[PDB]
From Swiss-Prot, chains B, E:
<comment type="subunit">
    <text>Interacts with spike glycoprotein E2. The precursor of protein E3/E2 and E1 form a heterodimer shortly after synthesis. Processing of the precursor of protein E3/E2 into E2 and E3 results in a heterodimer of the spike glycoproteins E2 and E1. Spike at virion surface are constituted of three E2-E1 heterodimers. After target cell attachment and endocytosis, E1 change conformation to form homotrimers. Interacts with 6K protein. Interacts (via fusion peptide loop) with host LDLRAD3 (via domain LDL-receptor class A 1); this interaction mediates viral entry to the host cell.</text>
</comment>
<protein>
    <recommendedName>
        <fullName>Spike glycoprotein E1</fullName>
    </recommendedName>
</protein>
<comment type="function">
    <text>Class II viral fusion protein. Fusion activity is inactive as long as E1 is bound to E2 in mature virion. After virus attachment to cell receptor LDLRAD3 and endocytosis, acidification of the endosome induce dissociation of E1/E2 heterodimer and concomitant trimerization of the E1 subunits. This E1 trimer is fusion active, and promotes release of viral nucleocapsid in cytoplasm after endosome and viral membrane fusion. Efficient fusion requires the presence of cholesterol and sphingolipid in the target membrane.</text>
</comment>
């Protein structure tokens, strides 16, 4: 499975709340008192009122189509056979259900 | 952590049930990311077994 | 090959991401790696990076170069110039857009060294490399000869059949380099054809586009008071862990992924 | 941290050859271990670098034609922090008190 | 796999007895080589012991 | 020193050999190695390759 995390949502100099959406095992969290820092300086210049909206869920792996394990419900086995029968100098090869 | 952490009725089926004990932690100060912790892939653990 | 490359490159927007190890302390490295998959039996690793591969900076099919960006400036490098290593040095197979394919041996961590003209910056990630052999005969390296079994390795084909990623409109990027200190004012000059959403912190906070021309910022003489938010949005960007989420940009788009794992012998 | 003439130049490495004092840029010369290291900064005799775990310490000095390196059988103890044994610093997680050599020139 | 897998009456004697269970396998298609599998050196094994 | 080098080099004919790992897939590489001997006590290895030295 591939973990799916969205881009963090920051309410700079403000408050924000997580929106409950529907994803496999989706989790949303709100983080306050966060001072994000970027390459081009600090993203938010307020100390408080920085709510961080983080949502993460689970996605099936990209290669799940090719590589995967399959569970089956097994019961009531059928029996088959290949018989190479020769009766009266008649060499006969065929399949006969058991 | 065991088999069945990801269950799909069909390979192409979009619907799937996920149970990986996914929980987030506090993001580190000065960084933007999604800090998450969860059990290892149950299918992967079964394969290692 | 042209179709998927064009699909990925019309809305690529290469970026720089936070990296734990920039070969000096910690920084935001353009070569930062966000995900590595090491499930290939032979040892091939399929990973996606901030930098793009397979085309130039002009959106033309050019697979021999690696395309990246620095501080909003898109730059490109020859693929053979830049190499990654592990516990032992690796070998690069091919790259396709965000995702990259290479032949790495077993290792505890992934590092790619980008040596520019004078500045050599590299990003390391503490992701283990699972080098799982084939069959019940545990070899630490592929043998020269022998019998063959069914094997699953990340094929280098660029076909993208049943997997994709979501690309959104990138969020606003802060750029304090654009902040200039003028006489009793700040002259944030946006670059050519660029909207710099200027945010100023003083009495009476103001937000302005100033897309074409810079604006004098009264009551906000000091440079640190005003923060410049570069806003280009030329192309969509991959939904990355390091990028801010633009709330008003719900611009999800599917981007079919290359280097899908395929069965073989 | 200084040139061959005793001037503050932290970006270069200074040495000597047969009594002839010569200098090289710091980035030019690198050391490695079981895995290649990363050099943080140098200060006179003492040098600070980011080396992963290894059994021996070796620095390769390649001049114009002569490449000379010295390897010493000194172990590199990559001792983790806390009760969670990690072979490489994690990307995220909780923080503890850690004792590391600060790069300050004090 | 044991001491004496190679036996020579003298150091300079050309004649020698070789018993290494040397068996050839199928060459890989598209490649030219001699695909042989044999036991490790019994002399080497005794040295390891 | 000249004698043995000349004896080897009068009939050298360097070649390229099939290599399992050519840094891309598999190919025939001019630098391919056929044998490595690793009995050196200090760690030194004497090996023969297609290329000459
Ligand atoms: C079936 O039996 C006949 C008669 O013994 C024999 O010639 C033939 O090869 C057999 N077929 C197979 C598939 O063994
Ligand atoms: C900036 O110039 C563009 C023309 O490219 C125009 O559409 C826009 O209105 C101008 N902005 C302002 C604030 O006048």
């Amino acid at each position: 499975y591939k973990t799916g995390m969205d881009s963090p949502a920051i309410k700079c100099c403000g408050s924000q709340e997580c929106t409950p959406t529907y994803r496999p095992d989706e989790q949303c969290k709100v983080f306050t008192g966060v001072y994000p820092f970027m390459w081009g300086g600090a993203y938010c210049f307020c100390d408080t009122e920085n709510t961080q909206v983080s949502k993460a869920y689970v996605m099936k792996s990209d290669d799940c189509l090719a590589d995967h394990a399959e569970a089956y419900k097994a019961h009531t086995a059928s029996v088959q056979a290949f018989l190479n029968i020769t009766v009266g100098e008649h060499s006969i090869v065929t399949t006969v259900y058991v | 952590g065991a088999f069945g952490d990801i269950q799909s009725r069909t390979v192409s089926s979009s619907d799937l049930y996920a149970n990986t004990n996914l929980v987030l932690q506090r993001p580190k100060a000065g960084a933007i990311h999604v800090p998450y912790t969860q059990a290892p892939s149950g299918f992967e653990q079964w394969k290692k077994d | 090959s042209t179709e998927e490359l064009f699909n990925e490159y019309k809305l690529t927007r290469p970026y720089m991401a936070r990296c734990i190890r920039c070969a000096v302390g910690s920084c935001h490295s353009p070569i930062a790696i966000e995900a590595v998959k090491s499930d290939g039996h032979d040892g091939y690793v399929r990973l996606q990076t901030s930098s793009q591969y397979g085309l130039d900076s002009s959106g033309n099919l050019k697979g021999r170069t690696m395309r990246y960006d620095m501080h909003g400036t898109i730059k490109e490098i020859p693929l053979h110039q830049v190499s990654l290593y592990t516990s032992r040095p690796c070998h690069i197979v091919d790259g396709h857009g965000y995702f990259l394919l290479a032949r790495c041996p077993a290792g505890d961590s992934i590092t790619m060294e980008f040596k520019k003209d004078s500045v050599r910056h590299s990003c390391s990630v503490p992701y283990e490399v699972k080098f799982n052999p084939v069959g019940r005969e545990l070899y630490t390296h592929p043998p020269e000869h022998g019998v063959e079994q069914a094997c699953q390795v990340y094929a280098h084909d660029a076909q993208n059949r049943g997997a994709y990623v979501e690309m959104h409109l990138p969020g606003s990027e802060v750029d304090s380099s654009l902040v200039s200190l003028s006489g009793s004012s700040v002259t944030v000059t946006p670059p050519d054809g660029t909207s710099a959403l200027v945010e100023c912190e003083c009495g009476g906070t103001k937000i302005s586009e100033t897309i074409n021309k810079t604006k004098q910022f009264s009551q906000c003489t000091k440079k640190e008071q005003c923060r410049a938010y570069r806003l280009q949005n030329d192309k969509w960007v991959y939904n990355s862990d390091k990028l801010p989420k633009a709330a008003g940009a719900t611009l999800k788009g599917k981007l079919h992924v290359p280097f899908l794992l395929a069965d073989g012998k």
